[PDB]
Predict the structure.
Amino acid sequence: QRNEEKAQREANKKIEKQLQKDKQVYRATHRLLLLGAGESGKSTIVKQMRDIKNNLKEAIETIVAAMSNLVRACYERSNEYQLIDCAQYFLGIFETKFQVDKVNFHMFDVGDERRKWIQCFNDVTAIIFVVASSSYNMVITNRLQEALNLFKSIWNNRWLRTISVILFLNKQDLLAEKVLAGKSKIEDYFPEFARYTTPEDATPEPEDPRVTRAKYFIRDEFLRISTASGDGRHYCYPHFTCAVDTENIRRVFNDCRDIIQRMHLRQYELL
Amino acid sequence: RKLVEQLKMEANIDRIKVSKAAADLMAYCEAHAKEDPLLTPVPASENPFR
Amino acid sequence: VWVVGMGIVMSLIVLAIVFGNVLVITAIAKFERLQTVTNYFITSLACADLVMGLAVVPFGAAHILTKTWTFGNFWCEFWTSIDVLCVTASIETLCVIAVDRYFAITSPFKYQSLLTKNKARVIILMVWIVSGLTSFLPIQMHWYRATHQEAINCYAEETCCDFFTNQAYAIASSIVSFYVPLVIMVFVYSRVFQEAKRQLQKIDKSEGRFHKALKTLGIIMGTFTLCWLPFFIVNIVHVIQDNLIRKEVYILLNWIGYVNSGFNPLIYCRSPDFRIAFQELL
Amino acid sequence: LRQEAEQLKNQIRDARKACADATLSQITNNIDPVGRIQMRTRRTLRGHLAKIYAMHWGTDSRLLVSASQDGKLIIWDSYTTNKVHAIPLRSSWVMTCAYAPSGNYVACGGLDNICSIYNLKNVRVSRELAGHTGYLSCCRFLDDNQIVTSSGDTTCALWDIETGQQTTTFTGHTGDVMSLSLAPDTRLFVSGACDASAKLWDVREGMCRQTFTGHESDINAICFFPNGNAFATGSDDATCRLFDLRADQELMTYSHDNIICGITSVSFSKSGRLLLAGYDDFNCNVWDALKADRAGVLAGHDNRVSCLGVTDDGMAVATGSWDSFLKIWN
Ligand SMILES: CN[C@@H]1CCc2c(ccc(O)c2O)[C@H]1O
């Protein structure tokens, strides 16, 4: 039947035109994955990059239940405890689409231990790994050590052999507060800090020397895993973002631009 | 807990020796080998893809 | 017994150019994993190199060795047109590849939207059309023919086909073929080197305490410049001053420019994917 | 406490060892080898944007459906290299797709926990099955209204499309379920989890009848022998194993010292003589089910393969790799 063939050809042509438009749209927009420990304040960066009262009260109930499991008199004792809980100061994949100037971006927010879905993400330009820099003292192996192990697992992946990592360190104010207080010193949990010293080249913000030493020690510990592996198609860009920093979006834009530039420069045998 | 009960339930299952199962599977494979376009190439004229 | 060695060398050069261009073209065409917007430009360069090596190199060798153009007067004009077209297409395709690299590095986000398969096809069609306009048109309708008493008899004669052109065409055609691509590619590679140096400085500043670009850019620019620039400066000079330039120097420089075409594939197809394709093919 | 379970497991292992009398290779060593097999790419299906994660042949052995990370679920007519329907997807990520034996419905679910089916007879969703936790791995159609889906929470579930709720739930896997296969009689189905354990379930009863844990790495593929009494599992480890249901233990192991990559899909032939298994090394291998000897290597894919499929008529086998291009291999 010639009519059936003609109809099938017309449908094929229409679908091909729609597919070409969709391919142009897909190539226009980049993709980023946001991986976090859950207690690393990944939501703060998500808000920074881009019923309610009952939910906030519900979170207080979880803290209240955790405090009892571990009221005003006992409230002070609960804060000193080290356990998985929400913030005490106040009391399902997600897709975020944002457009930096004249460019299209799209964020991936995954909602465990096996992480067998990591191989699915291979076309993303970068992985926005978010880790709390003030989580060294809290223990479950310390949470910071667990985050470092997860970063090592992601970095040394056969499937993710050409995906870079954008690294964020929230709770900088919290890190400074814990370092300056002196309780739970870095040397107590990280023996290398006693031998560690401030790097000769550094740009610290007008901050106490101890805070700078701690922050740079954490940054170097994270960067050692990245530098140990083979060079090329892998680069980590540490950042020291605060709890409230509106410049994070420009930082990730610059990091993605550098990722594309360095991929193209490693290609053509230039870099 | 319930794993013990699950294993106890799964234990009471009749078993067929490997020789009989292998012989039956080989007999099936030999019997149905004729109608296997992958095993025996099909004629080009009768091949739908060519 | 001295011409035979030159003939053997010319035959070897022609065979090498043909084999390299054919291998590059068949590697680009056969495997779909190698098809890319820039790889279309590489394919155009390889096709131009193949046409040049299969058309002008053996005929040029026959002209040089026998010192007599056996074929007719009309066919020699066609051969000269083919030569000019091939050279212009090759040089302008090198310029286009450099521009593609500049737009891929300097403007990364806009590079994907700027270049597409249709855009690459349009660019290749435009560059081949401009090469044809520069080569075939001024030759077939005899604008390039000289006006002085010299070589007018050569035009009339059938055996003689030595190149003799006006002071005008020898400058404009030379500019269009080489000088504009030279300036464009120099600016491109300066910008690319600056970007690479900036990136290396950033790597040193960030991941410190734990010259490839210069070498590769040197290879890419130096091969082209050393193999073509002297020929085109001689092209300008002999028209400006006919006393200095002899025929042998002209032919030698032109053939160095020719063998640049055979040198090109081994410097523009060094990617590991191309090596894997070559290994699989043979 | 756990001592009773350990004793039961030891007794099960002893019973399985006692049942084994002669190995499969010991009996099949006298059969003629299948011989060298050369398969050419009958057709190539291009134009698909991103890496394919799964595909499923039609019950008519002609049409097929493929899905990628681009969010496009495009239905292909394999005979004429023509795409009939292109279905945009609400969720960008798709880990599996299914084609109903009736052919009227096409299932498509992925990293989003919600599974959705489409009514082909434009295209629109019928009932987005959302009563699930975790991502999906593979889905199949028992009928036009009952669909069984895998899980990322180690809970294979059965669905009633009209009701929209889980009719029954299957539990017992330590790790996430990565693939499953259905029987010709649709009475029972098996599922290979990430805990290196393959379990056979009874659809009516809702409890695992047996459990096979001979592997060492995560199991990524499972399919039935055409007989229905034997299923072969392809694990992340290079070994591909063939199990039995009446013998209740492993029968054969397919492995070579040259291959060290993983396996992403396993599918039998029409007669079951050839076990076609994909690999992460950009190539698909063809094994002999009985003699356990490789009988050819299929290639032509730039990236790793992810899915396989053999038509009900057995005319040809299809492969969809990460290179965003399917291939039909008669
Ligand atoms: C006889 N050989 C020709 C003469 C002039 C000429 C060549 C190449 C490119 C040009 O733009 C030219 O003007 C040479 O190949």
